[PDB]
Amino acid sequence: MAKWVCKICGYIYDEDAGDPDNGISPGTKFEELPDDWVCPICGAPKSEFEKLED
Numbered sequence: 301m302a303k304w305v306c307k308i309c310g311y312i313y314d315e316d317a318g319d320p321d322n323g324i325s326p327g328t329k330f331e332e333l334p335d336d337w338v339c340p341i342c343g344a345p346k347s348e349f350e351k352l353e354d
């Protein structure tokens with residue numbers, strides 16, 4: 301699946317890993333994350349992530 305980078309801190313949201321410490325099971329697409337999910341490192345909102353692909 302895809303990877304998305306936080307443009308603030310460099311955290312990479314990996315859809316294969318999810319974010320299970322914050323309620324997100326592995327295999328959850330970025331578009332499926334709750335509207336109030338934020339970067340687990342810096343707190344940036346979803347708007348500040350970019351998909352890693354051309």
Ligand SMILES: [Fe+3]
Pocket residue numbers: 306307308309310311339340341342343344
């Ligand atoms: Fe961040």
